[PDB]
Structure 1
Amino acid sequence: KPFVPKLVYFEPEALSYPLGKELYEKFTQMGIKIRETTSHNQVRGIPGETELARYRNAKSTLVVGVRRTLKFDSSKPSAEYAIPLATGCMGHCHYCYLQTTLGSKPYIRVYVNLDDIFAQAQKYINERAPEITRFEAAATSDIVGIDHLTHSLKKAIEFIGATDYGRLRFVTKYEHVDHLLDARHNGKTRFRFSINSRYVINHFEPGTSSFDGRLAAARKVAGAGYKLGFVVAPIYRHEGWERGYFELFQELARQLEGMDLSDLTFELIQHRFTKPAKRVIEQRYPKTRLDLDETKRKYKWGRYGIGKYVYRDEEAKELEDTMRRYIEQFFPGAYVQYFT
C-alpha cells in the first residue's frame, strides 16, 4: 500500500549526491523503468495519449533532481518558511489546490542536495534568532507519504531537533509513518494529519489512507513523543455538513481517548478554488460531486498572482463558529491556531 513509482526520472547531477546514488541503486535493483531528464521542471515522454492519461501516469512518476532555488517561499499562516524537500503527490484529492498553483507539476519530485537545503534552513534560523522560526515541509507535497522511499523528512526532523531556535511541521493524509517513530525529533516537530467529514473523505479523497489509517498513525506518532495536531480542511458545506463535522470530532475524540491532549492543536481551512479550477477538475475527475459554483462565492483578489473563491463572510463565520464549538466540546484545552 505504500507509494512506489512505476516510472523514475533522474537529473544527471542528482547521481552526484548520496540520495540520488541510493535511489538509482534502489530502483535499478527493483527493475523499475528509469529515464534521464535535464531539468526536474521539464520532464518529457510521460506515457498517455489523452490529457487524463498523462495526468494519471504522472501521478505514478517519481523525479529525482537537485534543488537550485534555495530561496525559501513564505508559508503563512502555517510557518515562516516552506522547507523544500519534495513537490507533488500520489494522491487524487478532487479539490487539491496544488493542481492550479503556479508552476505545479503532476509528478512527484524529490530533492537530493539535503546539505544545501538544511544549510539554507540554518541561515534563516540564524537571521531571526533568538525568535523561533517554523518550517512547513508539506506545503506543495505529501512529504510523509513519499518519505519511506528517501527518509529525507526523517533527516530534516533530526536536523531541526538539533537546532535551538528551529521548529518543523507537516501534515499528511497517509499512514506510512513507521520509519519516523524512532527519529530524534527532540520535541521540535509538529506531526499533523488532515481530517474531514465522512462525506468529503469518501467522495473527494481517493488514493489516500482511510480515516482509521490516519488516526492509527496519529496514535503512533503521539506515543513516539511527537507534538500532535490536526488540520480540518477543506471545510466543505455539503448537504448535512453540520452533523457530518459534529460526528467527525465525536469520532476523533473517541479514537484519541486516554491520550494526553493538553498540547493538541487544530487548524481550520475552508474550501477554496481558483478561476481555472473548474476546467482542470472536470477534465481530471469527470464524475466528481465537487461544487465549484463561483456565483454563490466571494472572490478574494490576488496580490502578485490570481485570487481565489471562498465562502461568503456569513457562511465562513458560520463554519468557523460551528467548528470552534465542536472543538470546545470534545477537546477542551486544545488550541485552534487559525481559521482561514
Structure 2
Amino acid sequence: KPFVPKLVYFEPEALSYPLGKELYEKFTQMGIKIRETTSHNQVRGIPGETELARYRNAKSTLVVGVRRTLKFDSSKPSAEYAIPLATGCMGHCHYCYLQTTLGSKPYIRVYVNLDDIFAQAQKYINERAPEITRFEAASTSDIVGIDHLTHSLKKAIEFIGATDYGRLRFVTKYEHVDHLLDARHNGKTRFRFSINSRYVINHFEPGTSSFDGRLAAARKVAGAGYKLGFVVAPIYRHEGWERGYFELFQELARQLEGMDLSDLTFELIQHRFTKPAKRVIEQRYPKTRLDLDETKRKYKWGRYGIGKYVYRDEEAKELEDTMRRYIEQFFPGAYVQYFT
C-alpha cells in the first residue's frame, strides 16, 4: 500500500546493472535488511520456523537478480509471449494458481538486465513482422503492483510503444498506477484489471487493492489514453454466484459511465486447481472457504506437466453463457476475447 519489502536479496551480478545499483542504493538508504544470494532461484535463510511463517515472510521478501532464461514462454490465449520482468507477488489470493506452478517461488523477483530482455523481445517481434506480436508482462507476477519500486514496466511500455509491430498487455489487482500515467505508451499497451464478485474478492483476495481502488486506477489509465480491459477471473460457482456476477457487471458499468468503452475488452477464466493445490492451500490459508472438491470437477490431463481440474462442460457452458449475457447487457460493443 504500496508494497515495500522487509528483506531484500541481491545476486552479486545484479549490481553490474543500473537497476541493481539503484535498488541497492535505495534499500540501503532505507535501512532495510539486505542479503546476498548466488542465484535468484536459490534463496536461503528466509525467516520462519513453520511452513506458514516461511511462506508469509517470503511474500515480504524481494530478490534482485539477472534473467538468464533466455527463451520467452508462450502465453496463449492472452498473448504470443510472456515478457519476463518479474516473478512472484505480495498478494495472498487463496486460489492463486502460481502457488502450484512448476518452479514457482513465494518471494518476489525482479530482473535487472532490461537491455537483454527488450533485445530478445525485439528479436521475437522481428521474427514475426509484419504480423503483430503481443507480450504479457503479468504471467507469473503482479508486475504493476511491484513497479513503483523499479519502473521496469514503465520502461517496457515505452520500449513497446516505440516498436511498429509490438504490443504489450498486463493485468493487476493493484491501484498503484500513478507513475505509469505519463508513460509514452503510444496506444500499444492494454492495461487490464482483475475483477470478481463481492464474495470472491472479500473471501479470497486479501493483500490486494479493493474493487473501488482497482476501478479508480482503471479510470486513471483510461484517462491517460491506455487501452482498457478487464479479466473476470477466477469465475467461481459460490452460493449465489448468478446474482453476485450480475451485480459485479452492474456496478462496473456505473463506475465507468461517461467514458468511451468502444474498445473495452473482457477476458473470462473459470476457477481451476491442480492435484497438489488442496494440501498447499490448506497449509497456507487454514480458514479459507475455498472449495477444492475434485469429485464435482472434470480433469484436464497435462501435456509435459500435470493437468488441472475445471468445472464440468455443462457448468462451464452455463458460466460462459451467463457472463456473455451480462457483458452484452451492460457493455454492448465490448469484445469478449475468450472464455477458458
- Output one character per residue of 1:294-321: Cα deviation in whole Å (capped at 9) or x when no partner: 0000000000000000000000000000
The alpha carbon displacement at 1:70 in A equals 1.3
Q: How many angstroms apart in 2 are the aligned matches of 1:75 and 1:100?
A: 17
Q: What is the SS of the residue equivalent to 1:149? A: coil
- Pair 1:180 & 2:193 matched: no
Q: What is the SS of the residue equivalent to 2:318? A: helix
The alpha carbon displacement at 1:83 in A equals 0.1
Q: What is the SS of the residue equivalent to 2:148? A: helix
The alpha carbon displacement at 1:36 in A equals 0.1
- Pair 1:111 & 2:94 matched: no
The alpha carbon displacement at 1:54 in A equals 0.1
* Deviation >4 Å, runs of 4+: none
Q: What is the SS of the residue equivalent to 1:150? A: coil
Q: What is the SS of the residue equivalent to 1:52? A: helix
- Output one character per residue of 1:231-260: Cα deviation in whole Å (capped at 9) or x when no partner: 000000000000000000000000000000
Q: How many angstroms apart in 1 are the aligned matches of 2:145 and 2:93?
A: 14
Question: 2:34 is matched with which residue?
Answer: 34
Percent of aligned pairs with the same residue? 100
Q: How many angstroms apart in 1 are the aligned matches of 2:94 and 2:25?
A: 34
Q: How many angstroms apart in 2 are the aligned matches of 1:250 and 1:41?
A: 43
What TM-score, normalized to structure 1? 1.00
Question: 2:292 is matched with which residue?
Answer: 292
Q: How many angstroms apart in 2 are the aligned matches of 1:44 and 1:97?
A: 24
The alpha carbon displacement at 1:115 in A equals 0.1
Question: 1:243 is matched with which residue?
Answer: 243
The alpha carbon displacement at 1:11 in A equals 0.1
Q: How many angstroms apart in 2 are the aligned matches of 1:120 and 1:70?
A: 8
Q: How many angstroms apart in 2 are the aligned matches of 1:320 and 1:13?
A: 48
Q: How many angstroms apart in 1 are the aligned matches of 2:224 and 2:69?
A: 34
The alpha carbon displacement at 1:281 in A equals 0.1
Q: What is the SS of the residue equivalent to 2:182? A: coil
- Output one character per residue of 1:132-173: Cα deviation in whole Å (capped at 9) or x when no partner: 000000000000000000000000000000000000000000
Q: How many angstroms apart in 2 are the aligned matches of 1:122 and 1:222?
A: 26
- Output one character per residue of 1:79-122: Cα deviation in whole Å (capped at 9) or x when no partner: 00000000000000000000000000000000000000000000
The alpha carbon displacement at 1:324 in A equals 0.1
Question: 2:222 is matched with which residue?
Answer: 222
Q: How many angstroms apart in 2 are the aligned matches of 1:88 and 1:12?
A: 20
Question: 1:330 is matched with which residue?
Answer: 330
- Output one character per residue of 1:158-217: Cα deviation in whole Å (capped at 9) or x when no partner: 000000000000000000000000000000000000000000000000000000000000
- Output one character per residue of 1:262-305: Cα deviation in whole Å (capped at 9) or x when no partner: 00000000000000000000000000000000000000000000
Q: What is the SS of the residue equivalent to 1:135? A: strand
Q: What is the SS of the residue equivalent to 2:109? A: strand
Q: How many angstroms apart in 2 are the aligned matches of 1:298 and 1:19?
A: 45
Q: How many angstroms apart in 2 are the aligned matches of 1:107 and 1:94?
A: 16
Q: How many angstroms apart in 2 are the aligned matches of 1:258 and 1:247?
A: 19
Q: What is the SS of the residue equivalent to 1:80? A: strand
Q: How many angstroms apart in 2 are the aligned matches of 1:286 and 1:183?
A: 42
Question: 2:268 is matched with which residue?
Answer: 268
Q: How many angstroms apart in 2 are the aligned matches of 1:205 and 1:51?
A: 21
Stretches of structure 2 that go unaligned for 5 or more consecutive residues are none
Q: What is the SS of the residue equivalent to 2:144? A: helix
Aligned length: 340
Q: How many angstroms apart in 2 are the aligned matches of 1:305 and 1:35?
A: 33
Q: How many angstroms apart in 2 are the aligned matches of 1:330 and 1:291?
A: 30
Q: What is the SS of the residue equivalent to 2:316? A: helix
Mapping for residues 68-217 of structure 1, pairs under 5 Å: 68-217=68-217
Q: How many angstroms apart in 2 are the aligned matches of 1:223 and 1:324?
A: 26
- Output one character per residue of 1:56-85: Cα deviation in whole Å (capped at 9) or x when no partner: 000000000000001000000000000000
Question: 1:304 is matched with which residue?
Answer: 304
Q: How many angstroms apart in 2 are the aligned matches of 1:291 and 1:128?
A: 43
The alpha carbon displacement at 1:26 in A equals 0.1
The alpha carbon displacement at 1:33 in A equals 0.1
